[PDB]
Ligand binder design. Structure first.
Ligand SMILES: Cc1cc(C)nc(Nc2ccc(N)cc2)n1
Ligand SMILES: Cc1cc(C)nc(Nc2ccc(N)cc2)n1
Length: 282
């Protein structure tokens, strides 16, 4: 079926939970043996969210190459994304090592450091220009260059220096600051505006490594971001845009990382974002 009328048909019939459970039943199951090794217990934020072995990002290190991060490679759309958990106190150095080694230009952050009164990720970037951060375990230095605070999101320019080679690179930090503590946004308008700002920066484009996107577990809000981006790109590429099937795209992405889209409300919000976004494109 088309998307906008399949949407109203699920709303009128109140069957979002049944649709979402079908997706969960059909989703791929691949091994995640490296994630579960005992030496990696303090590299995982949640015991039930792990990268598959076949698509995990490897750190360029011979001691321990593990980070909870996955490469989502969308062949028809010609887009790639790295989805990862919010960094932990003992993985902030690994996180920036990955950004460096994978040649990423942008980092997309969809959570606040504290939500619901608990810590959802480490304060992994500097808050003041004159107070830089050094990661001694991976030999990187990180400096805040500038910060632009807007009503729904903040954009930061950061400098990452490999202290071994003295090479430097500019990284863009796109921080969506207004996702509610509970539920999903009422309107997708600010989320789409944010997506378009990331696109306009070059961070999603083939001349760079894959964008790094995270929330707390790296599957819920993070899944919504890449699902909406990929669906809209396919609608531009194809002769028949109504042939884009959001459930099939989500199942394709779940071949690369488990659990993408965590609730039926997030599924409905993804439909809404793609629907409204397709009107603005034209
Ligand atoms: C010398 C010194 C002393 C202190 C207290 N912080 C830093 N740098 C730093 C900046 C930002 C974060 N998040 C962490 C550390 N550096
Ligand atoms: C200069 C400086 C000063 C301080 C206090 N920390 C850092 N780096 C850092 C590394 C890992 C975590 N978690 C936090 C900070 N760097």
């Amino acid at each position: 079926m088309e998307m906008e009328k399949e949407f109203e048909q699920i709303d009128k019939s109140g069957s979002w939970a049944a649709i979402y459970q079908d997706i969960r039943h059909e989703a791929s199951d691949f091994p995640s043996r490296v994630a579960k090794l005992p030496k990696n217990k303090n590299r995982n934020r949640y015991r039930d969210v792990s990268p598959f072995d076949h698509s995990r990002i490897k750190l360029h290190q011979e001691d321990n190459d593990y980070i909870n991060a996955s490469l989502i490679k969308m062949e028809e759309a010609q887009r790639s994304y790295i989805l990862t958990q919010g960094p932990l106190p003992n993985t902030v150095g690994h996180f920036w090592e990955m950004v460096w080694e994978q040649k990423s230009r942008g980092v997309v952050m969809l959570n606040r450091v504290m939500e619901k009164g608990s810590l959802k990720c480490a304060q992994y970037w500097p808050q003041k220009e004159e107070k830089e951060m050094i990661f001694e375990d991976t030999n990187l230095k990180l400096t805040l260059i500038s910060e632009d605070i807007k009503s729904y999101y903040t954009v930061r320019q950061l400098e990452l220096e490999n202290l071994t080679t003295q090479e430097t690179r500019e990284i863009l930090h796109f921080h969506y600051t207004t996702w509610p503590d509970f539920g999903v946004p009422e309107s997708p308008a600010s989320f789409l505006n944010f997506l378009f700002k990331v696109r306009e920066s070059g961070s999603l484009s083939p001349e760079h490594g894959p964008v790094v996107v995270h929330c707390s577990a790296g599957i819920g809000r993070s899944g919504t971001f890449c699902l909406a981006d990929t669906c809209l790109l396919l609608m531009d590429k194809r002769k028949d845009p109504s042939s884009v099937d959001i459930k099939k795209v989500l199942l394709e992405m779940r071949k690369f990382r488990m659990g993408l889209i965590q609730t039926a409300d997030q599924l409905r919000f993804s439909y809404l974002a793609v629907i409204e976004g397709a009107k603005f494109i034209m």
